[PDB]
């Protein structure tokens, strides 16, 4: 009446007969309390920095002129390992300027012109004021 | 043979009641209380920074002119490992300028490259240096 | 060999035998109360920063002129690990103007004795005939 | 003839077990109260920042001119790990200006990652003929 | 002093010839009250920031001119981990000028627009393998 | 820290207390009252920020000109973890003008028929039903 | 006067119960009153912010000009975790200018058609210009 | 209706209502009064903000010009977790200029396959199943 | 003869403080409690930096002019391993300019003809026995 | 040769099996508690730097002029191994400038003045006639 018939062959279901039992493991003391690790009075530090700066009098910074970069005071960094092409780990004042362009120079093709005489003939010289037109009872 | 008198049965008498001959396993310890780990008086720190700056008088910053970048005071950073091409971990004042535009040339070909040679017979060719030493001192 | 008569002192013990009492144990015990971990007097810190700045007098910032970037005072950062191309972990004053670009140099920069040399593309040939008049201006 | 069937066992008035036979009768100290973990006097901190700034006199900010960016005062950040291409963890004053630029359609990187490089003896193929032992040598 | 030492409250305890040889009778002690975890005097903090700024005199902000961005005062942030391409965790003053308008490209030329279906080269639904014939792309 | 007045420690074996005697150790019971967890004197904080700013004199903000963005005063944020491409956790003054990326995804597919450039009136004659009858009277 | 607990037969008893009696012999505790958890002196806070700002004199805001965005005063936020592409957790002054396209998309037009009868509207209550037929249709 | 007759020994307490009973005065020695949890001296806060601002003199807001957005005073927010693409948790002054255009929310739809006809191939098998010709009797 | 010996004729050096302890004795046991590792009084540090700078009087910075870069004060960095082409681990003041080199002409600080101050000790070219070229020509 | 290789099954004397039993620990003590490693009084440091600078009087920095780079004070770095072509591990004051000849013209000596104040329209007609056809298939 079963929907599907089944048959045994190799009988692979648990030949090892594994079970929670130790052969002749019976004893007064078995499986003692394992001890992990003990740490007493130990100091561990990884990646730590501390900087202290004290200034009483004045620095006196009148006129300062620097082309590249300038760093004053105190700088501290804590690192272990670093990797990278063209990479920088610790750098005080970093400035890069480039402008090679095409590595070529050429004179200006333009800069040319031609004669353009307006040939002035008006002696009026603008002069908006004092109009030659004399109207009746001038508002001015 | 007879002198052996069997074994563990020499008495072959005594009493069976209240014999208490068997240990009955009165004392038996199994699966003791496992002990993990113990930590007493331990300090652990990872990635920590502390900076202190004190200024009494004045700095006196009249006129300051810097092209690139300038950093003053105190800077501190805590790191362990860093990776990245062109990457920067710690940099005080970072400025990169690469202006590119306006080109006089406009011909299809930027240049003809006159540097056809790939193995110059000059410069490197010049090898006036001698591998041998000026003075001779061979050991027989 | 009477030598010395008397000298009775058998009271003094010269052997351990078994004159020692044992302490009472826990007797029968199964599945003792497992002990996890114990922590007493322990300090743990990860990623912490503390900065203190005190200024009494004045800084005196009359005229300040900077092209790139400028950072003054105190800056502190706590980090452990960082990754990323072109990435920056700690940078005081970051300014980038324009950019060159990126090229994997797909074209063959170098070649080993090419039997049939060929330009990347285009490869436009030319022949002599007439030179362009656009050049010098020899009026007389 | 036993007058008393009970056997005058009035001495006993309690029964903990019947006939004794291989009866261990444990039921003693089983499943002790497991102890989790104990914490006494422990400090734990992750991702914490504290900054203090005190200014008495005046800064005196008359005229300030900066092209890129400028950050003054105190800046502090607490981080553990960071990842991202072109990403920035801590940056004081970030400014990027691009007058001329172009994107490679955001095409994927070649990532050749060659694992089979070729670099043998590379002996010079060319072999110009030279006078001496070879051919005829009447002059020498 | 009613017995001169070894008296008063001292009489006798335990020590029996044989009477009461049986201890109590039976003990259950099953399923002891399990103990979770105990916490006494412990401090835990995750993601916390505290900033204090005090200013007495005046700053004196007459004329200020900045192209990019400027941040003054105190800024503090508490973070543990961050991830994201082009993402920023902590940045004081962020300004990006991408702008628009590309005159470099100028008028179109190699547009090669998809024309109407003509002589289809995709006979098969799946696209052809890019690999065909090559072995001079690396050449170390 | 600056070391402790306690002195330099290199051993100082921990003090161990005698077990003395065990309090009974057997209550003779089943299903003892399980003990959850005990908390006495514990501080827990997650995501907290506190900022204090005090200004006496005046700032003196006459003329201020900034192209990008400017943030003055005090800013504090408490976070643990953050993720997102192009996302920003903490940024003081964020301004982005235009973007290099483009390539519009094209106009949405809805049809220009959605417009009504002719016969604005519609469904005016249509009114077979209104899915049930209901009263209405908008405020006026 | 508050009784902490009631003692049982504290005073010495003249006689003791006879163990011979079977009634009310012994009683083992079953199902003890389980103890949940105990909390005494504990502080818990999640997502809390507190900002205090005090200003005596005046700020003096005469003329202020900012292109992007500007935030002054005090800003504080409490968060734990955040996720989202292009999302922002804390940002003081956020402004993004896309300006997709440009003004007057249509190319210059000399108004090929002076008239423009589109999107009819009531001219009632409106008379920006004289509109109608030039015909006067004289009575006679 | 208006029942008043009482049943003799007929009435009986149900097990439904009897299921629920007060937990007090229970039987002693068995089923001790379980103890829930005890809380004494505990502070709990989740999502709380408090801001205080005091101004004596005047701000002096003569002429203010801002393109993007500007926020002055004090802003505080309390949050724990936030999620959403393009979402913002805390932002002071948010302005986006993009012709009120939409960025199209939601993930992209699958590519366009066929108009309607399908040609299953991954369904090929030793005994392909025929599709019912019923097709829900489509109008077609 | 003169040989001396003890009354007991003992041929062994005297010893004190047996210490004993660590006696395994005789008893059954299986799976002893394994012992991990023990750490008592140990200091471990990796990647740590500490800098302290104290200034009483003033620096006196009147006029400062630097072309490249200048760094004053104290700089300290902690690193283990670094790798990268063109990469820099620790650099105080980094500035690179690649726009247009000037005509920095300059003559060499050394350039003389090989006069050969010392020559082989040849008797033919060296005649210490005779001073000068004077020729002997005595009248007698 | 000799039919039936089998033979010499019976030993002349004694047994072939080893007297000693393999894999001991059959009982008594087996699997002793392995001991990891013990560390008492040990100091380990990797990558650590410490610099201290104290200045009483003044430095007296009147006029300072440096072409390349200058570093004053104290600089210390801790490293183990470094690799990279053209890479620098520790360098105080690094400045590199290009050195190209040319520069024949374009000197600042020449002044540039904008001509044609009226700025007349130029020839922007960059669309010359070019050969090309929609279809190409000569029938000849």
From Swiss-Prot, chains A, B, C, D, E, F, G, H, I, J:
Family, similarity comment: Belongs to the synuclein family.
Keyword Hydrolase attributed: no
Subunit structure: Soluble monomer. Homotetramer. A dynamic intracellular population of tetramers and monomers coexists normally and the tetramer plays an essential role in maintaining homeostasis. Interacts with UCHL1. Interacts with phospholipase D and histones. Interacts (via N-terminus) with synphilin-1/SNCAIP; this interaction promotes formation of SNCA inclusions in the cytoplasm. Interacts with CALM1. Interacts with STXBP1; this interaction controls SNCA self-replicating aggregation. Interacts with SNARE components VAMP2 and SNAP25; these interactions allows SNARE complex assembly and integrity.
Entry protein name: Alpha-synuclein
Ranges annotated as spanning the membrane: none
Ranges of compositional bias, category Acidic residues: 112-140
Organism of provenance: Homo sapiens (Human)
Biological process terms in GO annotation: adult locomotory behavior; amyloid fibril formation; behavioral response to cocaine; cellular response to copper ion; cellular response to epinephrine stimulus; cellular response to fibroblast growth factor stimulus; cellular response to oxidative stress; chemical synaptic transmission
Cellular component GO terms held in the UniProt record: actin cytoskeleton; axon; axon terminus; cell cortex; cytoplasm; cytosol; extracellular region; extracellular space
Region named Interaction with SERF1A: 111-140
Chief place where the protein resides: cytoplasm
Record note on domains: The 'non A-beta component of Alzheimer disease amyloid plaque' domain (NAC domain) is involved in fibrils formation. The middle hydrophobic region forms the core of the filaments. The C-terminus may regulate aggregation and determine the diameter of the filaments.
Tissue: Highly expressed in presynaptic terminals in the central nervous system. Expressed principally in brain.
Residues annotated to bind Cu cation: 2, 50
Consequence of changing residue 35 to K: No effect on oligomerization
InterPro entries noted in UniProt: Synuclein, Synuclein_alpha
Compartment list: Cytoplasm; Membrane; Nucleus; Synapse
Highest taxon of the lineage: Eukaryota
Effect of residue 57 to K: Increases oligomerization
PTM annotation (N-acetylmethionine): residues: 1
Modification note: Phosphorylated, predominantly on serine residues. Phosphorylation by CK1 appears to occur on residues distinct from the residue phosphorylated by other kinases. Phosphorylation of Ser-129 is selective and extensive in synucleinopathy lesions. In vitro, phosphorylation at Ser-129 promoted insoluble fibril formation. Phosphorylated on Tyr-125 by a PTK2B-dependent pathway upon osmotic stress.
